[PDB]
GROMACS .gro file of C-alpha atoms in nm:
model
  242
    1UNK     CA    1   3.025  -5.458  -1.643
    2UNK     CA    2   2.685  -5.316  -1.699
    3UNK     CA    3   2.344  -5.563  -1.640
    4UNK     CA    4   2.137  -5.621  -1.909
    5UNK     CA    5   1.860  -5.374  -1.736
    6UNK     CA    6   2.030  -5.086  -1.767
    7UNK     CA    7   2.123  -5.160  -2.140
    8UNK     CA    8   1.803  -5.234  -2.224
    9UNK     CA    9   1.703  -4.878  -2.032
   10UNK     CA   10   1.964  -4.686  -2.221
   11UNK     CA   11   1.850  -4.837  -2.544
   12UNK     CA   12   1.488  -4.766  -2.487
   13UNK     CA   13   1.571  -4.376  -2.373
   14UNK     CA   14   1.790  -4.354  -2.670
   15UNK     CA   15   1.595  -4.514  -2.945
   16UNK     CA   16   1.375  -4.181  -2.854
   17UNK     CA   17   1.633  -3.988  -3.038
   18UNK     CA   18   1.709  -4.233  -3.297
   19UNK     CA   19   1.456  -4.448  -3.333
   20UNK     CA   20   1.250  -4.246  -3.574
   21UNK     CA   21   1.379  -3.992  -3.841
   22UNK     CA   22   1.530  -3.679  -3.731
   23UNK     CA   23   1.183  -3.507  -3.951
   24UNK     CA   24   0.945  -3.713  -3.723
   25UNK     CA   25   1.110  -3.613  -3.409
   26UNK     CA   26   0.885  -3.446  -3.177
   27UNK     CA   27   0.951  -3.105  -3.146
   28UNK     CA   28   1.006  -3.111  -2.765
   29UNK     CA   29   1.336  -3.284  -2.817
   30UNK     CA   30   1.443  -3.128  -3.156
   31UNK     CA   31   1.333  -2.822  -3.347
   32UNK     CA   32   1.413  -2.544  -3.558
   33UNK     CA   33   1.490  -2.221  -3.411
   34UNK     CA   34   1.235  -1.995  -3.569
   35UNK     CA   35   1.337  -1.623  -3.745
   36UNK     CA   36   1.248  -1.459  -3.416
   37UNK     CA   37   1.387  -1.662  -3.156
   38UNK     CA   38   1.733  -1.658  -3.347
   39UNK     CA   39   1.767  -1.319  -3.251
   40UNK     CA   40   1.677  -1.389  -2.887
   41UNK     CA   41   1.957  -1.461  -2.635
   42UNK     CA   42   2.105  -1.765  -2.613
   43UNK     CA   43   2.021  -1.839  -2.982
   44UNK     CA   44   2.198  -1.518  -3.082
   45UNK     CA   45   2.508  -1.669  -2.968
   46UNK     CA   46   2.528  -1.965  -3.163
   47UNK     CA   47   2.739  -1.934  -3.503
   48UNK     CA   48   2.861  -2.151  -3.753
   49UNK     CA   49   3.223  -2.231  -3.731
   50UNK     CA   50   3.332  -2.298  -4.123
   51UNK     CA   51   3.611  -2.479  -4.250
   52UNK     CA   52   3.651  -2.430  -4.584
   53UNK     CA   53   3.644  -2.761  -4.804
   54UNK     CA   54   3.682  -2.924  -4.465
   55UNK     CA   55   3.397  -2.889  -4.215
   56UNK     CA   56   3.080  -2.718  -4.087
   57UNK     CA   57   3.044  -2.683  -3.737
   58UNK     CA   58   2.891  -2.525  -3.417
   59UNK     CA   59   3.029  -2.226  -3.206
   60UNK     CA   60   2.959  -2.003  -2.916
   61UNK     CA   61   3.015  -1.643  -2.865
   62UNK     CA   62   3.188  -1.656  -2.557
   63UNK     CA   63   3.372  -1.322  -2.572
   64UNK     CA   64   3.387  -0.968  -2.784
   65UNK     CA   65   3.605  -1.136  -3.014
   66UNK     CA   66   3.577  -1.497  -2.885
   67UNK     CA   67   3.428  -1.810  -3.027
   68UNK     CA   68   3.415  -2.142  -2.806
   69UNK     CA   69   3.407  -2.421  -3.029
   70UNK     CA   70   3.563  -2.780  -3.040
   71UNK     CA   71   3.932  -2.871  -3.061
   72UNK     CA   72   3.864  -3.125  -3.303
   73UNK     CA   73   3.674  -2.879  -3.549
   74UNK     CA   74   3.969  -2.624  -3.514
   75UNK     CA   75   4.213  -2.922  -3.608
   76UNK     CA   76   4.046  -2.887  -3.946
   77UNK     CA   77   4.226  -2.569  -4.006
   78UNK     CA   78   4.565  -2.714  -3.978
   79UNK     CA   79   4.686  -2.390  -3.747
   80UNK     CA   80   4.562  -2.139  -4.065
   81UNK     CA   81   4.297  -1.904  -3.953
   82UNK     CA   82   4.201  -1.790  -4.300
   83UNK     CA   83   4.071  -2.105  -4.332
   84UNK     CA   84   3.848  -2.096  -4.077
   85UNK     CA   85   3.531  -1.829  -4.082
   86UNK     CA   86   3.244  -1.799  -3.837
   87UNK     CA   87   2.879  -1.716  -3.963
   88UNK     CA   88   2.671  -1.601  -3.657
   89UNK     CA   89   2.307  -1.677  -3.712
   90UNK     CA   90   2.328  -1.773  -4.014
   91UNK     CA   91   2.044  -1.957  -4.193
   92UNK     CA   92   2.034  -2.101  -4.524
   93UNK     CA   93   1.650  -2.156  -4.583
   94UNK     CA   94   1.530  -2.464  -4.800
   95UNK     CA   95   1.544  -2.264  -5.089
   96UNK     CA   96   1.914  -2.187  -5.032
   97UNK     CA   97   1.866  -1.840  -4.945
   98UNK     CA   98   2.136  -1.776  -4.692
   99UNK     CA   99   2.150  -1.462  -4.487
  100UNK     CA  100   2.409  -1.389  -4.227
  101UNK     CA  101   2.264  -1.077  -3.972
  102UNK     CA  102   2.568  -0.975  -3.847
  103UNK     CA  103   2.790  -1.114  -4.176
  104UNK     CA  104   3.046  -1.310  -4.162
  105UNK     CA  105   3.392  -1.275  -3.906
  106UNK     CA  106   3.722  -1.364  -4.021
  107UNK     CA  107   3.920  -1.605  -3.772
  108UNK     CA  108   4.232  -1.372  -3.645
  109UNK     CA  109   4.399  -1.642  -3.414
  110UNK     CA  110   4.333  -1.988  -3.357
  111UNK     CA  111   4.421  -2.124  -3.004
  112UNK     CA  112   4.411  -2.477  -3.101
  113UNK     CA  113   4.414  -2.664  -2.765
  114UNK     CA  114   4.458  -2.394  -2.449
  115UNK     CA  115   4.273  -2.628  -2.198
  116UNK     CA  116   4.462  -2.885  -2.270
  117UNK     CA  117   4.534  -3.152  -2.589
  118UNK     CA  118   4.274  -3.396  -2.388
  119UNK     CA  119   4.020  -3.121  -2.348
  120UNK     CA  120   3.795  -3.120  -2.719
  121UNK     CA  121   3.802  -2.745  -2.671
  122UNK     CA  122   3.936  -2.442  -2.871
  123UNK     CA  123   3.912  -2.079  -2.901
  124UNK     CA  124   3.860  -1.916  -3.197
  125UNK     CA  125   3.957  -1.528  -3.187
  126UNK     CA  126   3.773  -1.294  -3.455
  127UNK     CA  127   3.880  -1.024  -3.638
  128UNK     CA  128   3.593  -0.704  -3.600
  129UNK     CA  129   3.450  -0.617  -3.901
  130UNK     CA  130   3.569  -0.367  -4.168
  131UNK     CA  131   3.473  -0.101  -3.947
  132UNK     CA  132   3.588  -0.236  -3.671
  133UNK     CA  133   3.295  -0.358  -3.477
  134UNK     CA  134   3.382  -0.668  -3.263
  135UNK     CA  135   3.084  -0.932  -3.306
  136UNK     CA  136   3.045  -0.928  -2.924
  137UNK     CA  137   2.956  -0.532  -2.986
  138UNK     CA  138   2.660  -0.662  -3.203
  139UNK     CA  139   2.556  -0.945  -3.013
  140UNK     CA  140   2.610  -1.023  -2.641
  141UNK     CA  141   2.837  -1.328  -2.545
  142UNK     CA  142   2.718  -1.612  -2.394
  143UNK     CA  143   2.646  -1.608  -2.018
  144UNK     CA  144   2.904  -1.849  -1.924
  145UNK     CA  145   2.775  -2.090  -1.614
  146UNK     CA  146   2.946  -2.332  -1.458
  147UNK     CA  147   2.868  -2.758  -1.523
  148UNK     CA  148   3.020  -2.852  -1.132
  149UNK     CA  149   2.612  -2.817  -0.982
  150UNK     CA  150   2.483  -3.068  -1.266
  151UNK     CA  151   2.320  -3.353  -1.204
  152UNK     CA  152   2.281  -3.732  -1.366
  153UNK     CA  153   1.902  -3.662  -1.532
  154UNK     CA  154   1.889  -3.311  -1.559
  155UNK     CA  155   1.772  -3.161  -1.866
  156UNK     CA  156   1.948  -2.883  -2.084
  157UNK     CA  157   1.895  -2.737  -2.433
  158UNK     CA  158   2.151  -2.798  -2.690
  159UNK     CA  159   2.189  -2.534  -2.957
  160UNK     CA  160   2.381  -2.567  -3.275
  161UNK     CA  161   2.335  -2.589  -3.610
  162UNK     CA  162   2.292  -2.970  -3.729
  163UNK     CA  163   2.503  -2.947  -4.035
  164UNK     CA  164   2.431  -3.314  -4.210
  165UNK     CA  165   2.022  -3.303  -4.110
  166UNK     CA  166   1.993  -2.927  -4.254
  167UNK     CA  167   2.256  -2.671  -4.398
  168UNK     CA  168   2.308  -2.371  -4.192
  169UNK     CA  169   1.957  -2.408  -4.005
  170UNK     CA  170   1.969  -2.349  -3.622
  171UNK     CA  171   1.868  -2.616  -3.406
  172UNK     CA  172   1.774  -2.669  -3.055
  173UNK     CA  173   1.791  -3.031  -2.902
  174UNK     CA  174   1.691  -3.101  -2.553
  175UNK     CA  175   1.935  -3.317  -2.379
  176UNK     CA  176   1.924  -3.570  -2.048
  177UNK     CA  177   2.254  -3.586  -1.832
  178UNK     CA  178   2.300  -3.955  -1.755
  179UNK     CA  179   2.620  -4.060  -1.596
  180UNK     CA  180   2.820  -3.807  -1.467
  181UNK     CA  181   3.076  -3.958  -1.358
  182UNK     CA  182   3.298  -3.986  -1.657
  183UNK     CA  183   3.247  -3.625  -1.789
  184UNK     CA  184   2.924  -3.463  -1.960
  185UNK     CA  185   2.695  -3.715  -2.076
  186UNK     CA  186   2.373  -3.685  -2.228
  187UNK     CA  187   2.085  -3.829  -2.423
  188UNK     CA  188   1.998  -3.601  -2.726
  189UNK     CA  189   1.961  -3.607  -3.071
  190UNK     CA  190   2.300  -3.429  -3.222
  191UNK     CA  191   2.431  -3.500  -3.583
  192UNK     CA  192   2.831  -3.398  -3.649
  193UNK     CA  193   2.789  -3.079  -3.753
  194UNK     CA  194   2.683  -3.017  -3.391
  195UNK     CA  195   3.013  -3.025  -3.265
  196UNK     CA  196   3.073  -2.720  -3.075
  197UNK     CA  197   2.690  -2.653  -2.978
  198UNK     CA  198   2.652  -2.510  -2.652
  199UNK     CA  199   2.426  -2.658  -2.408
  200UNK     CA  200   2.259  -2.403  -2.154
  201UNK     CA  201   2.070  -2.396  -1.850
  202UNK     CA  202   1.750  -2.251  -1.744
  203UNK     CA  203   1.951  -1.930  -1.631
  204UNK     CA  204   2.025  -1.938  -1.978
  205UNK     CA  205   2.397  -1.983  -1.871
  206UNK     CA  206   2.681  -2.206  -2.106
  207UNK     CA  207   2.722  -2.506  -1.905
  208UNK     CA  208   2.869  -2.691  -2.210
  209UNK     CA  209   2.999  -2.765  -2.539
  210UNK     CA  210   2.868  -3.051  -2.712
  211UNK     CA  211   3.167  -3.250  -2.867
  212UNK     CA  212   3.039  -3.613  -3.001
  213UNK     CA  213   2.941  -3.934  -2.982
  214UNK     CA  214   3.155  -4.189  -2.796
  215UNK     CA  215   3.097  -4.572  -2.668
  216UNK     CA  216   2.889  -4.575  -2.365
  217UNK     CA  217   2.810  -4.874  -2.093
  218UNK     CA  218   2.983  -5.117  -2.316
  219UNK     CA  219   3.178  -5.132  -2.694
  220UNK     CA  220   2.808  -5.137  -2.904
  221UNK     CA  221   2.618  -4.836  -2.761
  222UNK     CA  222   2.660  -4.448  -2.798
  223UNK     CA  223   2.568  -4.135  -2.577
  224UNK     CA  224   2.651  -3.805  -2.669
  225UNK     CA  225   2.941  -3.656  -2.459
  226UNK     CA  226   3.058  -3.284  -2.411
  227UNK     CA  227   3.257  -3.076  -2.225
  228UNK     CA  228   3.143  -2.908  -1.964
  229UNK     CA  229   3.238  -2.568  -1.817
  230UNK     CA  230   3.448  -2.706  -1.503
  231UNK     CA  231   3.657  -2.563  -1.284
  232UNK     CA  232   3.952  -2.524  -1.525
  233UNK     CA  233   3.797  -2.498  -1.812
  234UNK     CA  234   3.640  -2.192  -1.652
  235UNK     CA  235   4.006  -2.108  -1.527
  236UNK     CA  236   4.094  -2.081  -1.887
  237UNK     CA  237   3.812  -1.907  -2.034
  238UNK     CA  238   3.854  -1.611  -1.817
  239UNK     CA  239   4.243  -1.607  -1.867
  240UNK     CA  240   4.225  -1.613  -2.265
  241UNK     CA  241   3.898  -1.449  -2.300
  242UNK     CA  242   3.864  -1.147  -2.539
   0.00000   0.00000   0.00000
């Protein structure tokens, strides 16, 4: 069991995130990516995984042809890639003017659960375009770090795109590790459709995919969990890479 200290603690560093509307958050924990930065590395990695009639997610460029996402977003598809399409920077302004840079990549193969049914990760393998370009030829894949050197208050950024606060809008959270004893855990403001964001260092390496929320210190309180780039999850990445 957990002392009333540390839930009060955990509720006070939380209600930072939640406590106030997602709008009114200040922009050192959440903002928009702006037109300019989108184009920048990491940012340039981060795509929107799409689910048609199902769900819209987060994704990471992790390869020429390879998108990191969750294994619960990639359930969505039911095993059928032409369900599934991935939008790379793409931003839907207020006005619902959407533009997609590098257009939009068809889902060739979709590798439902390689790390493992217990591991909320899955790889997404794209199809190049009609010319045959490979989105990793037009953008370069995410650095991908390691999470084994992380440590219980260290801060990271969080990039996805926030599906249910704004559609198709790029957003950057900053997140606190907390206990790391039970996997990645971290304070941060996330919404659903940022399942799949990648979280990245400093180095600007992937340390991370952020997955959801799940119970945390007892049955009433949440903190954000993901899965972090360990030592076979790593294993994996550079076995089924492409």
């Amino acid at each position: 069991e957990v002392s009333a200290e540390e839930i009060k603690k955990h509720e006070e560093k939380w209600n930072k995130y939640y406590g106030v509307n997602a709008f009114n958050l200040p922009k050192e924990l959440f903002s928009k990516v702006d037109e300019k930065d989108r184009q920048k590395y990491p940012y340039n990695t981060i795509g929107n995984v799409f689910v048609k009639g199902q769900t819209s997610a987060t994704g990471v460029l992790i390869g020429k042809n390879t998108v990191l996402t969750n294994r619960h977003i990639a359930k969505f598809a039911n095993g059928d890639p032409s369900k599934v399409s991935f939008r790379p920077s793409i931003n839907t302004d207020d006005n619902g003017n959407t533009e997609t840079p590098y257009g939009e990549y068809e889902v060739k193969e979709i590798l439902q659960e390689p790390f493992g049914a217990g591991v909320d990760l899955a790889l997404i393998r794209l199809k190049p375009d009609q010319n045959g370009v490979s989105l990793g030829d037009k953008i370069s894949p995410a650095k991908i770090g390691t999470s084994n050197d992380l440590k219980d208050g260290d801060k990271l950024e969080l990039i996805g795109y926030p599906f249910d606060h704004k559609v198709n809008q790029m957003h950057r959270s900053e997140i606190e590790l907390t206990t790391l004893s039970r996997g990645l855990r971290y304070y941060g403001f996330t919404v659903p459709g940022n399942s799949g964001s990648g979280i990245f260092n400093s180095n600007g390496e992937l340390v991370g995919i952020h997955s959801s929320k799940v119970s945390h210190l007892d049955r009433e309180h949440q903190i954000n969990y993901g899965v972090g780039i360990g030592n076979y999850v790593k294993r994996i990445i550079n076995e089924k890479n492409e």
